[PDB]
Design a binder for this molecule. Structure first.
Ligand SMILES: [Ca+2]
Length: 220
């Protein structure tokens, strides 16, 4: 997260870290057994780390649970990062407490201009911002035209841009798979972008509101 601030510890209880030796992606807990992430973060097996704030220091609030299933959306297209959503089933259920809680799925698609929150342990591109401590950033959903203007012909129905065209505030690699929460619902998943926080290149996110049927049926 570039241009954001350190989240208040455990203020994003649904946020998880995907780890197979080191942190490589984020994810969002949606119930005691499942995590929603980005399909480009796919790995056959991964350890999901919940209840984290500082991913380098053991705090006593964490739960490390290995995945039992990692399911990418069947229509995921890697060359254009389309339908970049994935479900991770925990081998054992997570204990819901003050540090670990699920985030609700969207009841509808949020309109452009809706202010949301994106978080993660990705690069901050700052000498004073510690990416090891969960970072938070408020970003507005951008219009389809601003999105397509930024990435001509590359925006699909499963995508939406959010952030600032002027640059300075955006998600980055490391945040991939992470949550974009708007009004208490998971509207997006950190997906892609050119560079990080670069003017004219806002973040692109997987639009969760169009995958409700696949998500619920898969977890059913
Ligand atoms: Ca920790």
């Amino acid at each position: 997260i570039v241009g954001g601030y350190e989240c208040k510890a455990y203020s994003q209880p649904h946020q998880v870290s995907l780890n197979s030796g080191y942190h490589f992606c984020g994810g969002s807990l949606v119930n005691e057994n499942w995590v929603v992430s980005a399909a480009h973060c796919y790995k056959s097996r991964v350890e999901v780390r919940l209840g984290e704030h500082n991913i380098k220091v053991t705090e006593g609030s964490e739960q490390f649970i290995s995945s039992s299933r990692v399911i990418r959306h069947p229509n995921y297209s890697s060359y254009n990062i389309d339908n970049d959503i994935m479900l991770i089933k925990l081998s054992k259920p997570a204990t819901l407490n003050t540090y670990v809680q699920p985030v609700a799925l969207p009841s509808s698609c949020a309109p452009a201009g809706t202010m949301c929150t994106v978080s993660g342990w990705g690069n901050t591109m700052s000498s004073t911002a510690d990416k090891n401590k969960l970072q938070c950033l408020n970003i507005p959903i951008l219009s389809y035209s601003d999105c397509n203007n930024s990435y001509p012909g590359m925006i699909t129905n499963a995508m939406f841009c959010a952030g600032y065209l002027e640059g300075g505030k955006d998600s980055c690699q490391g945040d991939s798979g992470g949550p974009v929460v708007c009004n208490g619902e998971l509207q997006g998943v950190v997906s892609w972008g050119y560079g990080c926080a670069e003017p004219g290149n806002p973040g692109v996110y997987a639009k969760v509101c169009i995958f409700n049927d696949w998500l619920t049926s898969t977890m059913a």
